[PDB]
Curated annotation (Swiss-Prot):
UniProt domain Tyrosine-protein phosphatase: residue ranges: 26-281, 313-564
Subunit structure: Binding to large heparan sulfate proteoglycan structures promotes oligomerization. Binding to chondroitin sulfate proteoglycan does not lead to oligomerization. Interacts (via Ig-like domains) with NTRK3. Interacts (via Ig-like domains) with NTRK1, but does not form detectable complexes with NTRK2. Interacts with PPFIA1, PPFIA2 and PPFIA3.
Family the entry assigns: Belongs to the protein-tyrosine phosphatase family. Receptor class 2A subfamily.
Positions annotated as active site in the UniProt record: C222, C505
Post-translational modification remark: A cleavage occurs, separating the extracellular domain from the transmembrane segment. This process called 'ectodomain shedding' is thought to be involved in receptor desensitization, signal transduction and/or membrane localization.
Residue numbers on the Cytoplasmic membrane side: 1-567
Protein name per its UniProtKB record: Receptor-type tyrosine-protein phosphatase S
Localization per record: Cell membrane; Cell projection, Axon; Perikaryon; Cytoplasmic vesicle, Secretory vesicle, Synaptic vesicle membrane
Binding-site list for substrate: D190, C222, S223, A224, G225, V226, G227, R228, Q266
UniProt organism field: Homo sapiens
Amino acid sequence: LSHPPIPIADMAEHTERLKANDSLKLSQEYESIDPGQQFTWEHSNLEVNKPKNRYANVIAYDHSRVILQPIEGIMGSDYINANYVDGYRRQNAYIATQGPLPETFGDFWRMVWEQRSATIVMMTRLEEKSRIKCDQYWPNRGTETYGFIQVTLLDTIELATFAVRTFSLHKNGSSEKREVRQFQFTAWPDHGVPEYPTPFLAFLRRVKTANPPDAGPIVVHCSAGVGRTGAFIVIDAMLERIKPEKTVDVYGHVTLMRSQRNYMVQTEDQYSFIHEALLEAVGAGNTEVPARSLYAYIQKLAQVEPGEHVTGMELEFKRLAFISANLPANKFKNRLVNIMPYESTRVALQPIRGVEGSDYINASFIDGYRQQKAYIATQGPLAETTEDFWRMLWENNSTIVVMLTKLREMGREKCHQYWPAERSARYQYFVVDPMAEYNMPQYILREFKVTDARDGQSRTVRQFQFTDWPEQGVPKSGEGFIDFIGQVHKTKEQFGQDGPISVHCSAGVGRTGVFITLSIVLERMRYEGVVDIFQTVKMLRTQRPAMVQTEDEYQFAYQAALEYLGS
């Protein structure tokens, strides 16, 4: 009645309608959400329970609350601020709860134990822009006791946009030991919702694969346990829904959620984000592959299926498809009009008083496998942006430069020679001294001393220039490129860089993208034994446009991933 399901085919259009005229119908739809019934919240309001509430205004409805076994002689001991929430035809599939307080750490663990949960989803950083969102309810290492549950940290994996912690739980008296994994999403912005859903969707895939299909409810929490917690739940429930059903009903599911916990999906932006994520999720399907299945996967990609006129490989690639960059005074600072950094990931320079746009360089921060901003992807310097380049490196503590083009190819200038060789150069406040030049079969290593003139300080800069990329196409073997990636990264650890690796070719998307793609993929193969090239590329394209420009480029990443598996 009045807000019917949306077939996954119309999801595109529907979303754009809601978003029309600065999200006017989204807003009217959202404001109309109403479970339309009266709840009570007596337990949350017990005097003894009020300090167990992180926010006095975010309570637990009586009828859907999670009820803990009482502790003999302790009034109020059945209470936690938490409610069951439904998934798609999955009753009480989730527990939505606040981020635990020091005084409720024991309650939270006892909840996990008694509810037989195997998975915790933490939708927040402990602190975000100074403000504490959640206190740390788990041990730094080893075993800690909370109430009567002993929680042991077995393992910590920590990656660019989330962390996974593995725990063992043991209540005293029983030999029972239970395993629980906490997935912590670390990339939700301090303000608003994520610009793109791709990190969250990969986060969600992790969670779902780890969660055993016979456990109790997934425990989900942010700060209040309503806002991001809500988005996680709806997105998941709708991805479940579309397996047997091929329609989406966000409106309907948020409505059901509101009858279970106050405020689920707390902002319009969150409501919008849910639609964007679900939109992107129907877009790709599963592209992740176990190492053992890689070759077969590749072989399958290599065929022209009955029905299609192109390869599966090229069909997969097809599915992958600017304020400052435009300011008139920065327009000469771009090699190509149509290759610009996004505002949100652009690498801004320290502004220089009295020259507008001297905060601009065509460059973009890019996350790695383990850490965010592990790369800057930028174009080959122009004679006119050379100075800017050197300052970007200094200001951003980048001391490794990967150049993926010859200065000239196919009788065109690809890159200006932005480095000195015969003698020292001064590029503005920076003195760069050429220290050595190593000619390897497939690349050249150049080493520079860079001295800040202003304060006499100094850093070593190393530049790796790969010289074996064919001027048309892509390498026939990934061997040399693999070794190259290896060398750049050895050199990173060996001389303890914290800073990003700055990577460029000519426009700084194609080969640049392949380099960054493989740097991520090959480490993920080492540590997970899975590969997902498509999602890696998809991700890069959330931070810089057109990363991995061509089909052959895309295919090469597969090729190199394959050969690397070979060793």
